[PDB]
Design an enzyme around this catalytic site. Sequence first.
Site, PDB file in Angstrom:
ATOM      1  N   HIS A 266      39.203  33.442  43.335  1.00  0.00           N
ATOM      2  CA  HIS A 266      38.787  34.734  43.867  1.00  0.00           C
ATOM      3  C   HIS A 266      39.424  35.891  43.097  1.00  0.00           C
ATOM      4  CE1 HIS A 266      37.826  37.557  47.342  1.00  0.00           C
ATOM      5  NE2 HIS A 266      38.884  38.158  46.838  1.00  0.00           N
ATOM      6  N   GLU A 267      40.751  35.864  42.912  1.00  0.00           N
ATOM      7  CA  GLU A 267      41.434  36.896  42.126  1.00  0.00           C
ATOM      8  C   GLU A 267      40.800  37.071  40.756  1.00  0.00           C
ATOM      9  OE1 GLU A 267      43.838  38.965  43.713  1.00  0.00           O
ATOM     10  OE2 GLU A 267      42.719  37.636  45.080  1.00  0.00           O
TER      11      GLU A 267
ATOM     12  N   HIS B 199      37.823  39.169  40.455  1.00  0.00           N
ATOM     13  CA  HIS B 199      38.162  40.592  40.353  1.00  0.00           C
ATOM     14  C   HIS B 199      38.579  40.922  38.907  1.00  0.00           C
ATOM     15  CE1 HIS B 199      37.705  41.245  44.573  1.00  0.00           C
ATOM     16  NE2 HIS B 199      38.876  40.761  44.963  1.00  0.00           N
TER      17      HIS B 199
ATOM     18  N   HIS C 105      34.066  42.562  46.010  1.00  0.00           N
ATOM     19  CA  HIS C 105      33.742  41.672  47.128  1.00  0.00           C
ATOM     20  C   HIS C 105      32.248  41.562  47.385  1.00  0.00           C
ATOM     21  CE1 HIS C 105      38.111  42.199  48.668  1.00  0.00           C
ATOM     22  NE2 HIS C 105      37.995  41.104  47.930  1.00  0.00           N
TER      23      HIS C 105
HETATM   24  O1  AZ4 Z   1      41.465  39.699  46.042  1.00  0.00           O
HETATM   25  C1  AZ4 Z   1      42.301  40.186  46.803  1.00  0.00           C
HETATM   26  N1  AZ4 Z   1      42.026  40.903  47.929  1.00  0.00           N
HETATM   27  O2  AZ4 Z   1      40.687  40.921  48.305  1.00  0.00           O
HETATM   28  C2  AZ4 Z   1      42.971  41.507  48.843  1.00  0.00           C
HETATM   29  C3  AZ4 Z   1      42.722  42.991  48.795  1.00  0.00           C
HETATM   30  C4  AZ4 Z   1      43.117  43.547  47.437  1.00  0.00           C
HETATM   31  C5  AZ4 Z   1      42.013  43.671  46.450  1.00  0.00           C
HETATM   32  N2  AZ4 Z   1      40.813  44.108  46.877  1.00  0.00           N
HETATM   33  C6  AZ4 Z   1      39.824  44.237  45.974  1.00  0.00           C
HETATM   34  C7  AZ4 Z   1      40.039  43.918  44.663  1.00  0.00           C
HETATM   35  F1  AZ4 Z   1      39.078  44.043  43.725  1.00  0.00           F
HETATM   36  C8  AZ4 Z   1      41.287  43.460  44.335  1.00  0.00           C
HETATM   37  N3  AZ4 Z   1      42.295  43.313  45.202  1.00  0.00           N
HETATM   38  C9  AZ4 Z   1      42.714  41.037  50.260  1.00  0.00           C
HETATM   39  S1  AZ4 Z   1      43.382  39.429  50.607  1.00  0.00           S
HETATM   40  O3  AZ4 Z   1      43.447  39.309  52.044  1.00  0.00           O
HETATM   41  O4  AZ4 Z   1      44.584  39.224  49.814  1.00  0.00           O
HETATM   42  N4  AZ4 Z   1      42.247  38.321  50.056  1.00  0.00           N
HETATM   43  C10 AZ4 Z   1      42.376  37.601  48.776  1.00  0.00           C
HETATM   44  C11 AZ4 Z   1      41.890  36.166  48.923  1.00  0.00           C
HETATM   45  N5  AZ4 Z   1      40.620  36.236  49.590  1.00  0.00           N
HETATM   46  C12 AZ4 Z   1      39.829  35.106  49.422  1.00  0.00           C
HETATM   47  N6  AZ4 Z   1      38.632  35.098  50.023  1.00  0.00           N
HETATM   48  C13 AZ4 Z   1      37.845  34.037  49.868  1.00  0.00           C
HETATM   49  C14 AZ4 Z   1      38.219  32.966  49.098  1.00  0.00           C
HETATM   50  O5  AZ4 Z   1      37.459  31.818  48.907  1.00  0.00           O
HETATM   51  C15 AZ4 Z   1      36.343  31.792  49.783  1.00  0.00           C
HETATM   52  C16 AZ4 Z   1      35.793  30.384  49.744  1.00  0.00           C
HETATM   53  F2  AZ4 Z   1      36.687  29.440  50.132  1.00  0.00           F
HETATM   54  F3  AZ4 Z   1      34.701  30.266  50.515  1.00  0.00           F
HETATM   55  F4  AZ4 Z   1      35.410  30.058  48.488  1.00  0.00           F
HETATM   56  C17 AZ4 Z   1      39.455  33.045  48.503  1.00  0.00           C
HETATM   57  N7  AZ4 Z   1      40.266  34.101  48.645  1.00  0.00           N
HETATM   58  C18 AZ4 Z   1      40.566  36.842  50.913  1.00  0.00           C
HETATM   59  C19 AZ4 Z   1      40.928  38.301  50.698  1.00  0.00           C
HETATM   60 ZN    ZN Z   2      39.492  40.128  46.867  1.00  0.00          ZN
END
Ligand code: AZ4
Ligand code: ZN
Lengths: 165, 166
Positions: B119-120, B123, B129
Amino acid sequence: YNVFPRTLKWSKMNLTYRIVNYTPDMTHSEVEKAFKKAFKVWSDVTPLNFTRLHDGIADIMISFGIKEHGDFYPFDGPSGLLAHAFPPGPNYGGDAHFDDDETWTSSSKGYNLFLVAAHEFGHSLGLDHSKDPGALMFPIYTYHFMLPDDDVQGIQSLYGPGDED
Amino acid sequence: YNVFPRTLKWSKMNLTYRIVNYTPDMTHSEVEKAFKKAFKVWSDVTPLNFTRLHDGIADIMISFGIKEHGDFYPFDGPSGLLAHAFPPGPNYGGDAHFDDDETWTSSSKGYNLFLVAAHEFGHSLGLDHSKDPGALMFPIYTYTGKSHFMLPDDDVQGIQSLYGPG
Ligand SMILES: O=CN(O)[C@@H](CCc1ncc(F)cn1)CS(=O)(=O)N1CCN(c2ncc(OCC(F)(F)F)cn2)CC1
Ligand SMILES: [Zn+2]
Ligand SMILES: O=CN(O)[C@@H](CCc1ncc(F)cn1)CS(=O)(=O)N1CCN(c2ncc(OCC(F)(F)F)cn2)CC1
Ligand SMILES: [Ca+2]
Ligand SMILES: [Ca+2]
Ligand SMILES: [Ca+2]
Ligand SMILES: [Ca+2]
Ligand code: NA
Ligand code: NA
Ligand SMILES: [Zn+2]
Ligand SMILES: [Zn+2]
Ligand SMILES: [Zn+2]
């Protein structure tokens, strides 16, 4: 899916600000009036709305500080760096900081808070500096006010004109 | 006038990354494998290639930190914010930071590092998102319990809209 926007801009028209603290140099009312007028410069030529919060988290957090004040852009005493503001984004994004080792005024003396704040808020909304010497966003301060064309064109490039009449 | 223009995608296909430091929660090898697999999610469906550097500057600098860790986007202790990553660009652009007040895991006891990292890196490569509730880029962590991960179509479509297919 969503890719990121092409420019740093707020993805919403309804923005909040908070005056976190106040300069010794002016009354609370003068400061509030200067900031309100400075936001209106921008809302008058876009669809943006600005609402003041008295506490909590606002998009644009405004404060007066000296020297090290909690970011990578420490102030430097009298003169030099006067203020700075961060581009649109989370957390420190949008926030505007004013060096309280300057003298802030509601007049032609010192640095006029309205004028500097209007320029700061340009940064807060996504404008960098302009090469037009008559622009609000020209990088050098010189002391009714009407927002120059260059700045109108710049801000409208980000947010559109809102109601044109 | 000038605005602050965003870099909408990497202008080279060959990107480098560096694991600057390591969480206590996993072995070095486990961490390396999780990140390698997370980059592979994206390189498998685009022309992007990822190479690991051990020293110096890399495009995607990866680090673990807690609270205020050098970018004034502080972490918040256990839970809440888990990680953040910056969009494509110079300097901090592309970099990924993981909150080491979370418990990172190769399996399910805590947050699976591979899933969060994948996920990171979305980005890091230019995806925001998603609103598709089944996407990797949909911002809720969930865990299938299955040993294989398939990149959802929404994410394939998103990343290919930037870089094209493999
Ligand atoms: O990326 C990081 N964030 O979004 C931070 C916000 C900071 C931020 N926002 C925007 C941006 F461009 C950069 N940084 C929020 S968080 O709570 O730390 N978080 C990270 C991990 N997220 C996740 N979601 C689904 C997944 O697999 C889903 C699946 F299993 F179905 F595949 C795996 N990680 C949930 C949200
Ligand atoms: Zn994110
Ligand atoms: O904004 C702040 N700066 O530019 C800092 C640099 C830090 C910085 N750089 C970039 C960025 F995105 C954010 N912060 C330099 S400064 O000396 O403190 N600065 C000089 C220019 N200032 C000004 N104000 C009104 C005005 O009206 C002109 C008018 F009267 F014609 F309308 C013309 N310049 C404001 C104060
Ligand atoms: Ca802010
Ligand atoms: Ca100063
Ligand atoms: Ca980088
Ligand atoms: Ca956390
Ligand atoms: Na002062
Ligand atoms: Na940890
Ligand atoms: Zn500051
Ligand atoms: Zn400026
Ligand atoms: Zn960070």
